[PDB]
């Protein structure tokens, strides 16, 4: 009589006819915590107290030992925010910082979600348009550098349980690099990604032999500007 029905949904069985909602699976305290964290991190006010609150929220996400049931929600939230807000550098930077804080928590088993985290990061590294004079370029290049660093960390950490992750990332970045039509920012992001995902040998075997042509058909016209 006292057994929960949602338990049958947690076992993943096929005959189950009950479809739980969020309120049936997550406790109210965790929902309030998720809402508070998201409210704190996405505040753009320049007040010092707001910056302190943002840092505290990031530390809480990075250290709390009881966030096992919110991991899929964190991944989905990062994906959604990156997808629908590509014209806002502040939000993208916050999303990258949140992704960095999530994969540094030592109590979380992150392997199966690794690739799901590598898609938003990549979008922040080789996207043709980021944001909407010098300060904008500063922000864009800083964001690309941070994305490359995070990609390096992800590839190093989760490359063995995801067998085809490293070749896929390297091939994507290499395909983007060997394309004279792309604007220089995308080429910068692509070379950074190739270095981050492939490694020293990837650069030695795949990048150097093709450099002789690259500097003649790409770099010279750009230099002439």
């Amino acid at each position: 009589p006292g057994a929960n029905p949602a338990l049958a949904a947690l076992a993943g069985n096929d005959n189950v006819s009950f479809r739980p909602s969020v309120k049936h699976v997550i406790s109210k305290e965790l929902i309030l915590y998720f809402d508070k964290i998201q409210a704190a991190i996405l505040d753009d006010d320049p007040d010092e107290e707001k910056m302190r609150l943002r840092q505290a929220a990031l530390e809480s996400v990075r250290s709390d030992p009881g966030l096992h049931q919110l991991l899929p929600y964190f991944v989905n939230f990062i994906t959604n925010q990156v997808t629908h807000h590509l014209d806002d550098l502040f939000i993208l930077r916050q999303m990258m910082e949140l992704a960095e804080a999530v994969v540094q928590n030592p109590t979380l088993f992150i392997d199966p979600y690794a690739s799901a985290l590598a898609a938003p990061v990549l979008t922040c590294l080789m996207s043709r348009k980021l944001g909407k004079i010098d300060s904008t370029l500063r922000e864009q290049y800083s964001l690309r550098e941070l994305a490359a660093s995070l990609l390096s960390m992800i590839a190093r950490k989760y490359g063995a349980s995801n067998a085809l992750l490293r070749p896929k990332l390297t091939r994507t970045c290499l395909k983007h690099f060997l394309d004279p039509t792309r604007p220089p920012a995308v080429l910068f992001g692509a070379i950074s990604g190739v270095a981050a995902s492939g490694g020293p040998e990837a650069v030695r075997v795949l990048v150097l032999p093709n450099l002789k042509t690259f500097d003649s058909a790409v770099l010279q016209p750009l230099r002439e500007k």
Partner: peptide, 25 residues
């Protein structure tokens, strides 16, 4: 994309939407 957008409307976890659970199919 539509599912994800509905889940996180107004930056709040909507409690009436389906949970994120793993199945065998």
């Amino acid at each position: 994309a539509k599912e994800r957008y509905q889940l996180f409307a107004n930056n709040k976890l909507n409690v009436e939407e389906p949970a994120l659970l793993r199945t065998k199919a």
